[PDB]
Design an enzyme around this catalytic site. Sequence first.
Site, mmCIF file in Angstrom:
data_model
loop_
_atom_site.group_PDB
_atom_site.id
_atom_site.type_symbol
_atom_site.label_atom_id
_atom_site.label_comp_id
_atom_site.label_asym_id
_atom_site.label_seq_id
_atom_site.Cartn_x
_atom_site.Cartn_y
_atom_site.Cartn_z
ATOM 1 N N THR A 1 0.888 -1.274 0.046
ATOM 2 C CA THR A 1 -0.021 0.093 0.053
ATOM 3 C C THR A 1 0.707 1.220 0.002
ATOM 4 O O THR A 1 1.643 1.243 0.796
ATOM 5 C CB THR A 1 -0.894 -0.047 1.247
ATOM 6 O OG1 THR A 1 -1.727 -1.031 1.084
ATOM 7 C CG2 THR A 1 -1.687 1.220 1.592
ATOM 8 N N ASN B 1 -2.942 -9.418 7.991
ATOM 9 C CA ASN B 1 -2.700 -8.126 8.668
ATOM 10 C C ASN B 1 -3.632 -7.738 9.143
ATOM 11 O O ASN B 1 -3.842 -6.348 9.430
ATOM 12 C CB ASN B 1 -1.924 -7.296 7.674
ATOM 13 C CG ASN B 1 -0.680 -7.894 7.065
ATOM 14 O OD1 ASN B 1 0.030 -8.584 7.777
ATOM 15 N ND2 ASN B 1 -0.381 -7.385 5.883
HETATM 16 C C1 LIG Z 1 4.343 0.548 3.283
HETATM 17 C C2 LIG Z 1 3.841 -0.640 3.458
HETATM 18 C C3 LIG Z 1 2.622 -1.126 2.736
HETATM 19 C C4 LIG Z 1 2.039 -2.230 2.879
HETATM 20 N N1 LIG Z 1 1.058 -2.670 2.257
HETATM 21 C C5 LIG Z 1 0.576 -4.086 2.323
HETATM 22 C C6 LIG Z 1 -0.573 -4.362 1.495
HETATM 23 O O1 LIG Z 1 -1.151 -3.381 0.829
HETATM 24 N N2 LIG Z 1 -0.880 -5.797 1.486
HETATM 25 C C7 LIG Z 1 -0.537 -6.801 2.552
HETATM 26 O O2 LIG Z 1 -0.722 -7.730 2.470
HETATM 27 N N3 LIG Z 1 0.801 -6.376 3.204
HETATM 28 C C8 LIG Z 1 1.114 -5.031 3.003
HETATM 29 N N4 LIG Z 1 2.519 -4.767 3.740
HETATM 30 C C9 LIG Z 1 3.239 -5.905 4.402
HETATM 31 C C10 LIG Z 1 4.323 -6.004 3.513
HETATM 32 O O3 LIG Z 1 3.749 -6.911 2.456
HETATM 33 C C11 LIG Z 1 5.227 -7.204 4.103
HETATM 34 O O4 LIG Z 1 4.533 -8.366 4.451
HETATM 35 C C12 LIG Z 1 5.899 -6.395 5.187
HETATM 36 O O5 LIG Z 1 6.430 -5.228 4.682
HETATM 37 C C13 LIG Z 1 7.429 -7.495 5.731
HETATM 38 O O6 LIG Z 1 8.096 -7.442 4.648
HETATM 39 P P1 LIG Z 1 9.436 -6.566 4.666
HETATM 40 O O7 LIG Z 1 10.248 -6.686 5.949
HETATM 41 O O8 LIG Z 1 10.184 -7.260 3.199
HETATM 42 O O9 LIG Z 1 8.931 -5.073 4.079
HETATM 43 C C14 LIG Z 1 2.835 -3.340 3.735
HETATM 44 C C15 LIG Z 1 4.098 -2.849 4.481
HETATM 45 C C16 LIG Z 1 4.607 -1.785 4.239
HETATM 46 C C17 LIG Z 1 5.754 -1.437 4.989
HETATM 47 C C1 LIG Z 2 1.856 -3.073 7.179
HETATM 48 C C2 LIG Z 2 1.283 -2.005 6.373
HETATM 49 C C3 LIG Z 2 1.574 -0.579 6.647
HETATM 50 C C4 LIG Z 2 -0.030 -2.361 5.746
HETATM 51 C C5 LIG Z 2 -0.912 -1.545 4.815
HETATM 52 C C6 LIG Z 2 -1.870 -1.957 4.118
HETATM 53 C C7 LIG Z 2 -2.259 -3.369 4.224
HETATM 54 C C8 LIG Z 2 -3.386 -3.855 3.243
HETATM 55 C C9 LIG Z 2 -1.347 -4.207 4.904
HETATM 56 O O1 LIG Z 2 -1.931 -5.647 4.736
HETATM 57 C C10 LIG Z 2 -0.486 -3.851 5.772
#
Ligand SMILES: Cc1cc2nc3c(=O)[nH]c(=O)nc-3n(C[C@H](O)[C@H](O)[C@H](O)COP(=O)(O)O)c2cc1C
Ligand SMILES: C=C(C)c1ccc(C)c(O)c1
EC number: 1.6.99.1
Length: 399
Positions: free
Chosen positions: A37, A194
Amino acid sequence: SFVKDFKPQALGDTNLFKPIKIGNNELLHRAVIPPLTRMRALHPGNIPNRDWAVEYYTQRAQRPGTMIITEGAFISPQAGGYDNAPGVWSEEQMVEWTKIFNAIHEKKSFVWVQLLVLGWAAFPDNLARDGLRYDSASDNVFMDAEQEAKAKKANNPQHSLTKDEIKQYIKEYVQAAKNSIAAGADGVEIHSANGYLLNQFLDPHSNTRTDEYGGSIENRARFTLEVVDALVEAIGHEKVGLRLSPYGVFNSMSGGAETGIVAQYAYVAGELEKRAKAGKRLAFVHLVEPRVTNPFLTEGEGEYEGGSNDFVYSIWKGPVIRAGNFALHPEVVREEVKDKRTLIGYGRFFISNPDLVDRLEKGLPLNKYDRDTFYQMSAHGYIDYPTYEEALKLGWDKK
Ligand SMILES: Cc1cc2nc3c(=O)[nH]c(=O)nc-3n(C[C@H](O)[C@H](O)[C@H](O)COP(=O)(O)O)c2cc1C
Ligand SMILES: C=C(C)c1ccc(C)c(O)c1
Ligand SMILES: [Cl-]
Ligand SMILES: [Cl-]
Ligand SMILES: [Mg+2]
Ligand SMILES: [Mg+2]
Ligand code: NA
Ligand code: NA
Ligand code: NA
Ligand code: NA
């Protein structure tokens, strides 16, 4: 700048760089862009950003054969509540998504739309403004005090869904999945992680229901599995994945403090494997690791050490994507990808490194990310992070 104290490792000699088929897609490597996101969609209408979104995805599609999962996309107005996250219900949205999908495909990469329903994580005042409910599994447990108070002030108190309302969401998931495929997506990911609506049903903290949708493991899993089944029927199992975060605490989920949490998720995995053995195997299961129980926290914080997702592999026998603090830990990735059906999602460092895959193969420095622009309405911190070559030209090897 590059991340200061990081010691990169070349991962080209590992299974991260072996091809694998996910659904209909022949991936050329196993570094996946998980859903992120970014809040660049424009209001009104939750429209994918008309100026920058194509370029953002094009940049991140640059390594041929990359699997990209989109930012979460709302299946309907009622599923939403963030003005700057995109939807996949309207013609005006799909016009922009089509351009994004086409651009990813021109780079020889692949794109899966994450289908999002917010539940109690929505902003109740945005929903009230638009004449929409503020939904969750229950009506007597709230995400936090501020959300509860905002809902009351908006004359939109949290509402426990009726069975009919659950059915209406399922209809919307089906139509959103159809819209995604028709516009050219390779598949969809059901967001059941989440702490969003489906996770609010899975979790016994947020689900205090006494009907068939709560009060037991099977009942708490019912909505998620109904969505799985409805999408498998509509567009095929090869075009459907599911995201889960067993140990997550983001959005007030229980995590490992709930002693029944592994059983709850083991049940879901088992039901997926039953369907697979009966001929309808999902394209993948995507797991958020206990490495990151809350992605708002800097890498290394909020790590739960009391549980592993390894149990899922004893149950589900298909591809598994794992995400959570892997960019800074090539030593951990090197061990995990020894399993031949494991892919690795890189979230925050794909925000800041459009050429992350090259950097992983070759053991190059990583661009530091800028958390302040994760959700800003700007090209800055979205489409202006440099490739490694561009960073060298900027002198980042000497910053
Ligand atoms: C800015 C941001 C936006 C995210 N948006 C989503 C999202 O739209 N859907 C989702 O399932 N997880 C979302 N996440 C979780 C990430 O997909 C991911 O699981 C999490 O950041 C851990 O991985 P990383 O350490 O590689 O960032 C988001 C995380 C961040 C930091
Ligand atoms: C971890 C974040 C910021 C995040 C934002 C949007 C969605 C849908 C999500 O699953 C996780
Ligand atoms: Cl740094
Ligand atoms: Cl908003
Ligand atoms: Mg009430
Ligand atoms: Mg700044
Ligand atoms: Na190396
Ligand atoms: Na511009
Ligand atoms: Na195992
Ligand atoms: Na800058």
